[PDB]
Scaffold this active site. Structure first.
Site, PDB file in Angstrom:
ATOM      1  N   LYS A  52       0.846  -1.211   0.000  1.00  0.00           N
ATOM      2  CA  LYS A  52       0.000   0.000   0.000  1.00  0.00           C
ATOM      3  C   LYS A  52       0.867   1.242   0.000  1.00  0.00           C
ATOM      4  CE  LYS A  52      -4.063  -2.194   1.861  1.00  0.00           C
ATOM      5  NZ  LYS A  52      -3.457  -3.534   2.025  1.00  0.00           N
ATOM      6  N   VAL A  53       1.701   1.282  -1.029  1.00  0.00           N
ATOM      7  CA  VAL A  53       2.754   2.289  -1.146  1.00  0.00           C
ATOM      8  C   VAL A  53       2.103   3.663  -1.148  1.00  0.00           C
ATOM      9  CG1 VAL A  53       4.709   3.034  -2.489  1.00  0.00           C
ATOM     10  CG2 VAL A  53       4.142   0.636  -2.450  1.00  0.00           C
ATOM     11  N   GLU A  56       9.865  10.076  -4.868  1.00  0.00           N
ATOM     12  CA  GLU A  56      11.236   9.585  -4.753  1.00  0.00           C
ATOM     13  C   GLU A  56      11.332   8.354  -3.845  1.00  0.00           C
ATOM     14  OE1 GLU A  56      10.183  12.848  -4.756  1.00  0.00           O
ATOM     15  OE2 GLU A  56      11.618  13.879  -6.043  1.00  0.00           O
ATOM     16  N   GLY A  95     -11.823  -8.107   1.550  1.00  0.00           N
ATOM     17  CA  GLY A  95     -12.981  -7.925   2.426  1.00  0.00           C
ATOM     18  C   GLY A  95     -13.980  -9.070   2.367  1.00  0.00           C
ATOM     19  N   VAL A  96     -13.574 -10.191   1.773  1.00  0.00           N
ATOM     20  CA  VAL A  96     -14.430 -11.365   1.666  1.00  0.00           C
ATOM     21  C   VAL A  96     -14.276 -12.228   2.907  1.00  0.00           C
ATOM     22  CG1 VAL A  96     -14.881 -13.460   0.314  1.00  0.00           C
ATOM     23  CG2 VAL A  96     -14.211 -11.284  -0.826  1.00  0.00           C
ATOM     24  N   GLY A 103     -17.002  -9.400   5.965  1.00  0.00           N
ATOM     25  CA  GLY A 103     -18.442  -9.416   5.654  1.00  0.00           C
ATOM     26  C   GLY A 103     -18.791  -9.572   4.193  1.00  0.00           C
ATOM     27  N   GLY A 104     -17.813  -9.456   3.301  1.00  0.00           N
ATOM     28  CA  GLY A 104     -18.072  -9.584   1.864  1.00  0.00           C
ATOM     29  C   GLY A 104     -18.393 -11.004   1.449  1.00  0.00           C
ATOM     30  N   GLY A 123     -19.427 -14.752  -4.135  1.00  0.00           N
ATOM     31  CA  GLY A 123     -20.146 -14.720  -5.402  1.00  0.00           C
ATOM     32  C   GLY A 123     -20.589 -13.332  -5.816  1.00  0.00           C
TER      33      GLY A 123
HETATM   34  N1  FNU Z   1      -5.329  -4.976   0.512  1.00  0.00           N
HETATM   35  C1  FNU Z   1      -6.443  -4.624   1.192  1.00  0.00           C
HETATM   36  C2  FNU Z   1      -7.192  -3.522   0.819  1.00  0.00           C
HETATM   37  F1  FNU Z   1      -6.778  -2.758  -0.245  1.00  0.00           F
HETATM   38  C3  FNU Z   1      -8.396  -3.254   1.461  1.00  0.00           C
HETATM   39  O1  FNU Z   1      -9.181  -2.313   1.138  1.00  0.00           O
HETATM   40  N2  FNU Z   1      -8.772  -4.094   2.458  1.00  0.00           N
HETATM   41  C4  FNU Z   1      -8.026  -5.140   2.850  1.00  0.00           C
HETATM   42  O2  FNU Z   1      -8.469  -5.880   3.760  1.00  0.00           O
HETATM   43  N3  FNU Z   1      -6.834  -5.356   2.281  1.00  0.00           N
HETATM   44  C5  FNU Z   1      -5.978  -6.481   2.707  1.00  0.00           C
HETATM   45  O3  FNU Z   1      -6.572  -7.712   2.345  1.00  0.00           O
HETATM   46  C6  FNU Z   1      -6.486  -8.669   3.410  1.00  0.00           C
HETATM   47  C7  FNU Z   1      -7.878  -8.912   3.963  1.00  0.00           C
HETATM   48  O4  FNU Z   1      -7.713 -10.065   4.788  1.00  0.00           O
HETATM   49  P1  FNU Z   1      -9.008 -10.730   5.504  1.00  0.00           P
HETATM   50  O5  FNU Z   1      -9.922  -9.623   5.953  1.00  0.00           O
HETATM   51  O6  FNU Z   1      -8.353 -11.473   6.652  1.00  0.00           O
HETATM   52  O7  FNU Z   1      -9.667 -11.643   4.496  1.00  0.00           O
HETATM   53  C8  FNU Z   1      -5.526  -8.067   4.407  1.00  0.00           C
HETATM   54  O8  FNU Z   1      -4.173  -8.448   4.039  1.00  0.00           O
HETATM   55  C9  FNU Z   1      -5.686  -6.570   4.216  1.00  0.00           C
HETATM   56  O9  FNU Z   1      -4.516  -5.863   4.620  1.00  0.00           O
END
Ligand code: FNU
Ligand code: FNU
Lengths: 214, 214
Positions: free
Chosen positions: A62-63, A68, A171-172, A176-177, A180
């Site tokens: 998440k740069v 630079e 977010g799956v 809660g996501g 499908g």
């Molecule tokens: N890269 C992510 C995003 F851009 C974002 O909006 N939300 C996230 O959760 N992650 C990452 O996705 C993963 C979610 O993990 P789990 O909830 O355990 O299924 C973690 O590594 C989070 O850091």
């Protein structure tokens, strides 16, 4: 991505991370490795995983720095063998283009993070997210991240980036996501805890895959 | 902070980073270590610096994830011996509170990054930055980062966080900011390239200190 499923490997010790990843490898093609694992075990963990599992690796860093510094972070990350890096769009176009330039030099790819999946994303990120996505399109970004927890937002983001862009979605499960519903809009889902904290991670992965094969 | 000057040590190899830091140690009390150095040399570099120079270390990790991931990044960072960590405010209050909770557990401190110093910060961060600062105040944040390149913004941010809060400011030298103007509002300045790329880093540090003693 194999089975449209990306493992978020956020365990913090190498033995547990290697065990779980090996157990679910028949179900995935792609592992997202972030700072929880890298800051605990070192950047060498990326090449170790890539070799031991023959999986692609997305460095979820998440740069979010000035151009630079972003350039340096990207060069160190691709040197370590990552296939792709996740970059925040919120710091603006120059910071994103710095990452794109290093990816172009190293033959690698950038994923642009638009809207995040957690509740706090509503405060500042959500109101900028459509504009962040458009900025991505204007910079030639082809790979994007958007939130499983808000499929109406994920639909809008798909509508901005178009059908040819590649969109992955975290977010799956834990957050809660739904697998499908998310795959109506995203090309692949990212799943961490619902797999890596399961009593049987392979069974958890297999269950998710079953639910989306149909 | 000794002489109100914090070194941004963004060299990427240990021998050069150790040389320059040792050369300027009589002028500083505090070193900011970010991902360019950590991703090249490992997290063990933090404890090495802290021991070898007896300096405080700010881990400039611009933490910008969901609350659960932020918690892990902070715990790994404080385990490695960092005194403080820089956290983005743009991802919202839950992500910031996750970092504050780990800092409270580990006896450490969080710096909240409000507005960034580079041109792209104007696109999305600047319009949210006052509200990010207020959120910090509402969460009990005492330490903040704001931009040397925009002293009118740095004045506003000071006006929001009040006089008791501690404010540090990057963008001095290479990015165009001025040491003395920045210190009208910030408690300390962060300087990287103007020191670490100088033919004589000690002379460059000494020159900056001279210019702000008066
Ligand atoms: N890269 C992510 C995003 F851009 C974002 O909006 N939300 C996230 O959760 N992650 C990452 O996705 C993963 C979610 O993990 P789990 O909830 O355990 O299924 C973690 O590594 C989070 O850091
Ligand atoms: N932490 C920072 C911010 F919040 C910000 O808004 N701007 C920054 O430049 N940095 C960091 O401050 C340093 C600036 O370095 P120099 O330009 O060479 O003097 C680098 O480490 C940057 O990553």
């Amino acid at each position: 991505v194999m089975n449209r499923l990306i493992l978020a490997m956020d365990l913090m010790n190498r033995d547990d991370a290697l065990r779980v990843t090996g157990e679910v490898r028949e179900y995935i093609d792609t592992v997202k490795i972030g700072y929880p694992l890298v800051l605990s075990e070192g950047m060498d963990i990326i090449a170790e995983f890539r070799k031991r599992f023959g999986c692609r690796i997305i460095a979820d860093f998440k740069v979010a720095d000035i151009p630079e510094t972003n350039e340096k972070i990207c060069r160190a990350t691709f040197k370590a063998g990552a296939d792709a890096i996740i970059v925040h769009g919120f710091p603006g176009a120059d910071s994103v283009r710095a990452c794109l330039n290093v990816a172009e030099e190293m033959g690698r790819e950038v994923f642009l993070l638009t809207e995040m999946s957690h509740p706090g994303a509503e405060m500042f990120i959500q109101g900028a997210a459509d504009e962040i996505a458009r900025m991505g399109v204007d910079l030639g970004v082809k790979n994007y991240v958007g939130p499983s927890t808000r499929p109406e937002r994920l639909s809008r983001l798909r509508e901005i980036i178009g059908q040819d862009s590649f969109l992955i979605s975290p977010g799956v499960g834990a957050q809660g996501g739904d697998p499908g519903e998310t795959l109506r809009f995203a090309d692949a889902i990212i799943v961490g805890r619902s797999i890596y904290l399961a009593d049987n991670p392979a069974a958890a992965a297999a269950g998710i895959i079953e639910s989306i094969k149909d």
